[PDB]
Ligand binder design. Structure first.
Ligand SMILES: OC[C@H]1O[C@@H](O[C@@H]2[C@@H](O)[C@H](O)[C@@H](CO)O[C@H]2O)[C@H](O)[C@@H](O)[C@@H]1O
Ligand SMILES: OC[C@H]1O[C@@H](O[C@@H]2[C@@H](O)[C@H](O)[C@@H](CO)O[C@H]2O)[C@H](O)[C@@H](O)[C@@H]1O
Ligand SMILES: OC[C@H]1O[C@H](O)[C@H](O)[C@@H](O)[C@@H]1O
Ligand SMILES: [Mg+2]
Ligand SMILES: [Mg+2]
Lengths: 731, 744
């Protein structure tokens, strides 16, 4: 067993060698000296194999390395960005996506992924919303579990199973002004009821590692916050793994303003941080700290032990080359089967935001633009229409970017012999040339040249007037989201929005195919564009999936996991909000002396859980099996859902709960369950949810996790706004 | 003795009479005469007129069983009839003496008219210019906000409220109400205890410390409990930590609003309120309708009721109302104390002192002559005054002027007419409506602030303004908010000058005539376009009843503007919240390096406000020498002096607000990059110099640490002094636990 092995190995180690197990730098000489615990961001089974060989056969103790990478939403086969993927509301698909990525990365030498990112955010200004699963902690927790299980399986024993890392612990999504890395501040009540569940869920699914976040919490950088890293993570949740810092998280504490390198390094290890990504604070200062009594041997041994336990659990003491099969890349990476899975999952992620009836032939009843049969002349216009490198999305560091088909390319393939695909760039990404450059960093250039916006527009209107339909491929470049990609405006960029206006003015039918990493402020578009399909960033096979949606091969079923506000002045806007002492009643905007603004109502443009289909769904009244239950009972909430339209398709039936009265104020609703059903036209299904006191608990004023007696409102519907309702009492 | 008298009085009262002292209906609430007869009423508010107040007091004294006199409340916020600037504007004076004076005058007038209690000062810290109630406070900063709280309470109450022109003040809104989410009024507040004490609480404390007689509970939740039911707030902090000896009143229907908050029925929330330390029920009738049943049922004890009742009675005793219930009911005072020339003269001085000159660039008026700033200018020729704020009397006082005679204030045109008669012709055009949307204009101009928007087209209004402008030598563009675009329940998600006014502005600028933007506002606005295109921008906030004359004083150079901002002006609403006393983060963007990938910064704008905290210009300029510290190392027992030479390097005499900032460089918790720790407002003639000195003592360097202990920690500090929070000179010093006791 493990304990004996690790005792024995640790009894042989110098203080230096124990310290070295905590170092995760950016080298061959470092490894020879036992100064390296793992490496990260190295791609290639050949390279990784040789570096491992150096560790195993050229270091004193032969201790093998962890190899980390950001395998976020795929290795080479790119699934949608996680925010888009969350919109599937399909935990099976989500697990599959993480399984596939793990198969691919492990085939290439990777034993550790810095995934899943589970940070709750209600601030769409923050670029890293693209990497999470929205604003809701329940959905977030379900997804966390599915991702950890996809990567790790049961116990990481297989050679296609890798170690996961829940990030970023904790509260990183609440950075002030939506500005990446900025100050976080909240009450402990808010932490537990509104932000912490996804981290806890990952821990409880047996995630092997946790990454400390960049932000402060209660005035202490997370990386030096013992309350977080010991009392909560270990003390409350029982985490038995190790904590890794984020990139230079230790030395950044110097800038935060809590001390010099040695001081903040000691505080981090004493807080419960075990591995030091890049900063070399542990390597360069811990021995001195140990000599001065600032860090005990016991603390060092604990951190070292954790690191070694992770390597044992990965099977790296049994076989250091477990993940270095030179034969596997050809078999496992970027296969047709994987790419087909990604295409399917991509089409499942898209959210149909709008699809109004339009006068398409004179005299006929108006009908929607989507789906349509690929015939005639299909214009595909905009700066996202013919970009390969912008399809996979941010955080695709192992992808071959210029290998993904552009939207034009993919649609051309899919329509060969049936229709003509007419392309026009239409506009730049944005008017400001310097913004376009930083927005298209990391190889996402759109090849901006000297053609002016006016020239670009004029070409596009020429093409548009030769067309039977216009697909406007607009929105963000993929690096307008991700890290250090915060925005103060959330519009479709200026020149693109002008292009869209002008395309609408041709009189031809226009479908907005919207690429984004975040919620955008779309009131103008919701008013004037007949059809809007949010395609997020669908992955390496996005172009094909977009075709599947457009041509009706897939009926869109995605639902939003994050509120789309009307303007930036409404931030933060989220569905699970408190009622206030002065709630504005429905339809009463504007009312003086209620909680409301002078210039806009309180509502998002599109609420949490919103998503349309090519069919329609109708809900009966909710049947509750009990009107009362006690603290040990249960009941069933049933509703019949009928496909009332003409298309087969899926519906995410959503369960919300309102605790009507509380000893503290309680949100107007909370997501507490969901089921994704598929129905043929005319077919019905009775959807049943179990409700029990376990589900009705929350963290009260004293942070006690408790369900209080009183009345509850159970709400079931097609989104967080449009619901059927009923009540019961807890005794 | 007060204790004897109140014991004796409380020994006579029934449970219904004790409960009745806790009840505060609104009049000016049903069946008030009969409720007073029954002893069911402890106070009233919103009744104006010393005649009416005396009648009702006589009812209480002569026709209730026990004759217990009433408190009479009103929102005396920035004046009774003589209106001073709105408090946010007033705060830009950086002048505590003037602030105290404004409060003294308002107390003199209010008390003349029967009023014994003002629901002032509002001291809520806010970093969010969306929130309309920023107009009512004194900006983002706790140091300045604390000093203002003190000055206001002292102004209203004096030493001990003994005089018949001193009234009881009420610090509001306890607590954290300025952090409402989305800047939407009444919305959820949430923050750490550390943030509360370091960043929000001090001005409430400074009001308690100044002897404020009462505190008003806020509308917001704190830690998921409505403030009105938050025992931690109303007992543990207010009494347990600060030793507040007064009483707590709810805000309007605060108790019954807890039903909507979602913590129970009227009886439950009323019981929880009184048990929390709330002493008086504004309007809800929660206390009067449910407290006896609660006492029967054991939900509230007789000791809790007695404690609340006693606080109300002690307030009345401390105000001198048992001694003379008609102390403030002198029917002859109104004719000699209210809206007097002496009061109005002070209001005009204080108003001119509140204005903030945001921009005043050189303009070439005529070829061959060197360019000069538009401000100030001698009144000559043809002066156009154009805009929806140009000829509105009723919008001059500002929001929260509930006792003012709105349509007696001169409009800006009228004011400029009087001041320039015989010297210049004032030409006038409306130019635009307040905003394109009529329904918005309506809600924006409620409470008697109509601009009398008519059925003219935007074209009619604009063309009339252009005919004026093209005949004029200078254009005074009177634009911005109506007064009721700020105040309570006036939150905005856009902070621009409204659409049709900004179009008007553009068109006036296109004439080529020189334009001065005289900006009326209750809040920070997003003014990047205006800062780029308008030569001169004078922020006049809302100046009060004498605003028009004060504006003339500034434009013509009778007063040199010396206001400084107390709240950050963002470049856009997507930067909110933006405040000077922020943390460094782990990845600070170095100055001048926007944009840099992997630093804390946005893709589309830099991190900076358009105008920072403490920003403001003058008709002259001031230069700062380097800082001289009297010593470089002290210990906890010591002190040092920071000194800077400030010189008037321009051609005009003028006042400068010299501002002291301190940065605690390293902490056990992260510390802000600076915090205001002092200021001095100096007046300098052209060429003149003055050495400004600040005492720095370890007690000023204290903050609430992780464990909420108010401590100073040894380490390095940076002393910064300058003309605003951005443009500062620097010097460093070290604090130790133990240093030299003598020179050796
Ligand atoms: O005048 C007492 C307090 O009144 C509050 O303003 C109320 C408002 O909350 C209520 O909706 C309307 C209903 O007509 O009456 C106003 O007076 C203010 O929040 C307090 O600052 C003020 O002291
Ligand atoms: O790849 C490991 C972790 O890296 C962080 O992103 C860093 C960024 O913080 C740093 O400035 C640049 C330096 O080029 O490298 C990136 O890797 C991410 O925040 C983590 O999520 C990631 O797991
Ligand atoms: O239009 C001129 C004036 O008319 C009325 O006297 C209004 O009360 C006033 O606000 C306005 O300035
Ligand atoms: Mg309940
Ligand atoms: Mg320090």
């Amino acid at each position: 067993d493990m304990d004996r092995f690790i005792d024995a190995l640790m009894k042989k180690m110098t203080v230096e060698e124990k310290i070295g197990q905590l170092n995760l730098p950016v080298i061959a000489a470092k490894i020879k000296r036992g100064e390296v615990g793992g490496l990260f961001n190295l791609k290639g089974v050949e390279k990784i194999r040789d570096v491992q060989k150096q560790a195993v056969e050229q270091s004193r103790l032969g201790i093998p390395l962890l190899f980390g990478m950001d395998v976020i939403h795929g290795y080479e086969t790119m699934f949608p960005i996680p925010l888009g993927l969350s919109c599937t509301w399909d935990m099976t698909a989500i697990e599959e996506s993480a399984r596939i990525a793990a198969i691919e990365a492990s085939a290439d030498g990777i034993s550790w992924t810095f995934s899943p990112m589970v940070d709750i955010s209600r601030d769409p200004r923050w670029g890293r919303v693209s990497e999470g699963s929205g604003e809701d902690p329940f959905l977030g927790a379900m997804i966390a579990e599915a991702m950890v299980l996809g990567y790790q399986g049961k116990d990481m024993q297989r050679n296609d199973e890798i170690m996961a890392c829940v990030k970023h612990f904790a509260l990183y999504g609440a950075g002030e002004g939506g500005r990446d890395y900025n100050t976080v501040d909240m009450s402990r009540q808010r932490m537990f009821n509104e932000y912490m569940l996804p981290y806890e869920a990952a821990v409880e699914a047996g995630v092997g590692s946790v990454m400390a976040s960049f932000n402060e919490v209660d005035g202490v950088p997370a990386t030096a916050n013992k309350w977080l890293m010991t009392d909560v993570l270990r003390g409350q949740w029982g985490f038995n793994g190790f904590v890794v810092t984020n990139y230079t998280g230790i030395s950044e504490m110097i800038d935060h303003g809590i001390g010099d390198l040695q001081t903040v390094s000691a505080r981090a290890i004493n807080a419960g941080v075990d591995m030091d990504m890049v900063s070399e604070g542990f390597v360069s200062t811990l021995k001195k700290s140990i000599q001065e009594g600032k860090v005990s041997m016991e603390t060092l041994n604990t951190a070292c032990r954790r690191i070694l336990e992770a390597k044992y659990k990965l099977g790296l003491f049994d076989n250091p080359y477990k993940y270095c099969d030179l034969k596997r890349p050809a078999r496992d990476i970027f296969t047709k089967a994987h790419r087909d899975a990604a295409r399917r999952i991509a089409a499942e992620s898209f959210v149909l935001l709008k699809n109004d009836n339009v006068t398409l032939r004179p005299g006929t009843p108006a009908e929607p633009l989507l789906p349509f049969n690929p015939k005639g002349n299909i214009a595909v216009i905009g700066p996202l229409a013919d970009s390969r490198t912008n399809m996979p999305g941010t955080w695709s560091v192992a992808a071959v970017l210029d290998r993904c088909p552009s939207l034009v390319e993919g649609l051309k393939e899919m329509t060969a012999g049936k229709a003509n695909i007419l392309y026009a760039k239409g506009s730049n990404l944005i008017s400001d040339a310097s913004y376009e450059e930083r927005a298209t960093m990391f190889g996402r250039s759109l090849n901006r040249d000297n053609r002016t916006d006016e020239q670009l527009l004029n070409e596009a209107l020429t093409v548009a007037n030769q067309s039977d339909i216009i697909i406007a491929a607009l929105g963000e470049s993929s690096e307008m989201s991700g890290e250090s990609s915060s925005r103060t405006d959330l519009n479709i960029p200026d020149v693109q929005q002008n292009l869209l206006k002008e395309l609408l003015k041709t009189g031809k039918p226009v479908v907005l195919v919207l690429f984004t990493g975040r919620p955008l402020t779309l009131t103008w578009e919701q008013e004037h564009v007949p059809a809007i399909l949010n395609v997020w960033f669908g992955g390496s096979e996005a172009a094909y999936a977009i075709g599947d949606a457009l041509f009706g091969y897939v009926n869109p079923g995605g639902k939003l996991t994050m509120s789309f506000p009307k303007n930036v002045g409404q931030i933060p806007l989220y569905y699970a909000h408190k009622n206030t002492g002065r709630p504005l009643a429905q339809g009463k905007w504007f009312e003086k002396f209620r909680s409301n603004y002078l210039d806009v109502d309180n509502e998002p443009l599109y609420p949490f859980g919103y998503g349309l289909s090519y069919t329609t769904f109708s809900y009966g009244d909710i049947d509750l099996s009990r009107s009362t239950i006690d603290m040990t009972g249960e009941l069933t909430a049933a509703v019949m859902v009928t496909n009332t339209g003409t298309w087969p398709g899926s519906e995410v039936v959503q369960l919300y709960i309102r605790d009507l009265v509380g000893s503290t104020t309680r949100p107007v609703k909370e997501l507490k369950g969901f089921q994704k059903i598929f129905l043929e036209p005319g077919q019905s299904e009775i959807v049943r949810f179990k409700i029990a006191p376990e589900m009705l608990r929350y963290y009260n004023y004293d942070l006690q996790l408790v369900a209080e007696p009183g009345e509850f409102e159970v709400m079931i519907g097609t989104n967080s706004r449009d619901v059927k309702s009923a009540r019961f009492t807890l005794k």
